[PDB]
Design a protein around this nucleic acid. Structure first.
Length: 186
DNA sequence: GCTATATAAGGGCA
DNA sequence: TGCCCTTATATAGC
């Protein structure tokens, strides 16, 4: 699909974070007692942690009725898993709705299949880069348009994060592609 | 396991 | 105020 992805590479979506408002106060201890695949340690974190096999995800359910869903490989899968959780809560006795579902972070990654001269890339783009190999082996590239953060490795492996729309993930990778090429390690 | 990245939700505390 | 708490996930040298 060289028309949409000129580099001929499509970043793989790895993790999606979403939120939804169940729109009802939830008794968390009641839920932690009735729910099987759930864990709740208020002294550690103020949320019940639930999980489902398909789509493989984890939800953080708060007393406020708010809910975080993480782990899905796509946006649809995240909405889908979010709905299965809402229905679990519904079946637990709370008048749970599904208000304001929103994708909050999309995580993707790809392999350009060639090593990068991270120091040169960093040096040529100081304004956007943070490369301190002794702290983290990857170059932290904070792209301005779109506002996306890329983790660039010597191996040619790239992690694109911070997107709320998958096109931001694709766009960021397309913008960075010619840059990675410019600093290919020979 | 850790280091780092983005992100939401909450309680708790300087 | 504002930071960390926790969860997921790719990446990789500790």
């Amino acid at each position: 699909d060289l028309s949409k992805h000129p580099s001929g590479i499509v970043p793989t979506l790895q993790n999606i974070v979403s939120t939804v408002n169940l729109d009802c106060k939830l008794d968390l201890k009641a839920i932690a007692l009735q729910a099987r695949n759930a864990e709740y340690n208020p002294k550690r974190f103020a949320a019940v942690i639930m999980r489902i096999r398909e789509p493989k995800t984890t939800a953080l359910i708060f007393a406020s009725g708010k809910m975080v869903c993480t782990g899905a490989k796509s946006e649809d899968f995240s909405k889908m898993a979010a709905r299965k959780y809402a229905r679990i809560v519904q079946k637990l006795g709370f008048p749970a709705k599904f208000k304001d579902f929103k994708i909050q972070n999309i995580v993707g990654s790809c392999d350009v299949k060639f090593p990068i001269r991270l120091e040169g890339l960093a040096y040529s783009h100081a304004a956007f880069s943070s490369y301190e190999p002794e702290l983290f082996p990857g170059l932290i590239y904070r792209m301005k348009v779109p506002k996306i953060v890329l983790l660039i490795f010597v191996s040619g492996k790239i992690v694109i994060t911070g997107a709320k729309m998958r096109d931001e993930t694709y766009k960021a990778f397309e913008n960075i592609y010619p840059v990675l090429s410019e600093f290919r390690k020979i």
